[PDB]
């Protein structure tokens, strides 16, 4: 991927998460489970939906009637028409096919980017209170119960509150 996330370090999707596009898995003392980031996910849905809708809605359609109305002493004109129809067919086919390829690429990269951005968001929250494993997972140096992890997601993680405990484990697990 462009952002090395989706098929890079996070080497795989979770069938367990079904309530969103991007989100979290956790395992503590209290149990393990999935949660979904409703913000990044809904923003993504809005984005992609808008993209589809705009590939659809920007097309001007007007009445036309086609059309074989020339006789056998008007074949030159008939050929002019053929050239025109064939021309437009070529233009539209090439354009549509390429547009789909290009925008599909952009879409997958957009997903990649969203994932990576969520990752870095969490990473900036935790710093040295946890270790990066390199698979999109953070091994906590302190004790993070359900309330703590919901604070990680919510963007409300209290770094100094665990910094010492972590510092012990670190500077004891790094022992």
């Amino acid at each position: 991927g462009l952002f090395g996330a989706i098929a890079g370090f996070i080497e795989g999707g979770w069938q367990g998460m079904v309530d969103g596009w991007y989100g979290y898995h956790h395992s503590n003392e209290q149990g393990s489970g999935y949660a979904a980031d409703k913000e990044s996910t809904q923003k993504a849905i809005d984005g992609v939906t808008n993209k589809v809708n705009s590939i659809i809605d920007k097309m001007n359609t007007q009445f036309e009637a086609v059309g074989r109305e020339f006789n056998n002493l008007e074949r030159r004109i008939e050929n002019l028409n053929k050239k025109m129809e064939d021309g437009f067919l070529d233009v539209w086919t090439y354009n549509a096919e390429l547009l789909v390829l290009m925008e599909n690429e952009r879409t997958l990269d957009f997903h990649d980017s969203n994932v990576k951005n969520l990752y870095d968001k969490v990473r900036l929250q935790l710093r040295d209170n946890a270790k990066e494993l390199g698979n999109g997972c953070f091994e906590f140096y302190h004790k993070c119960d359900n309330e703590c992890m919901e604070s990680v997601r919510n963007g409300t993680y209290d770094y100094p509150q665990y910094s010492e405990e972590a510092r012990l484990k670190r500077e004891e697990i790094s022992g």
Binding site: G13, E29, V48, I55, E69, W92, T93, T107
Partner: protein, 322 residues
Amino acid sequence: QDQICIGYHANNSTEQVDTIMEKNVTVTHAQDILEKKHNGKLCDLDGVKPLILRDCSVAGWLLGNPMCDEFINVPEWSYIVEKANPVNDLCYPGDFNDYEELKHLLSRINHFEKIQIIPKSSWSSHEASLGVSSACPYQGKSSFFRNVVWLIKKDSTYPTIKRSYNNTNQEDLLVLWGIHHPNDAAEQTKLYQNPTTYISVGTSTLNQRLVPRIATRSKVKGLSGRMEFFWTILKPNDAINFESNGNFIAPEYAYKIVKKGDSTIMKSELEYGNCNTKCQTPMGAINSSMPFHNIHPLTIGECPKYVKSNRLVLAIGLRNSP
């Protein structure tokens, strides 16, 4: 000791998508942008039903070819449907002058009404009842186009016709008439009496003089004679003046016409299907919002762009590998 992991959605879907750099990438969700479905039926177009001629051509329907179904008055239509090769065209062989332009003119009509312009009963110096052919069979018997009158000499004379009709209606009038080209001088004398003959037609705009052409021709339906038909649009308060020495196929009925837009003649073998659309195809209507289709090139209405493709799938979700 505890973990926080970042990851992304997955499922069992098999929807595939192509990419500029990669093919057949399984993906979480996808949306096709290409319309492939039609209802197999002939429908109204934006609320207006089409004129469906069954085994009748436009010419056969306008002149009233006896073997065409009896003129039901459709006062309005959005497009015309003809079969590829309609069986009832010109029952007496010949031609329609500027035929394709006439069909195009009639392809969409806001108002259409057949009226009697010159009663048959009004040809007192000519026979109006013998103008009949076996090639034009009706109610058992030798007949003729119904909207138009084949005049023949009465006793052994064909005095000069001078007849005029003033369009006192409030709408344009489609007027039709014709000329008969016989096979030889003998037939010319037998039908009309005068050997050298003409038809002149005059309007505010038209200045026409037709002369029959004698020539030896192949039999078509057992006949060597030919009938050539002509037409104009007579404006409100204009008159049309006919003068003729013989070979005149006179108007009887004409049509009030109101034209507001244009379409075309659709060639299709289908039947009416009591529906409505914005886009009609000869294979069926399209219920559309998609910007592209691959049904058929020959469409009428507000249609998506015709394309040579079986598939235009947009990725919406994400890579959904095993």
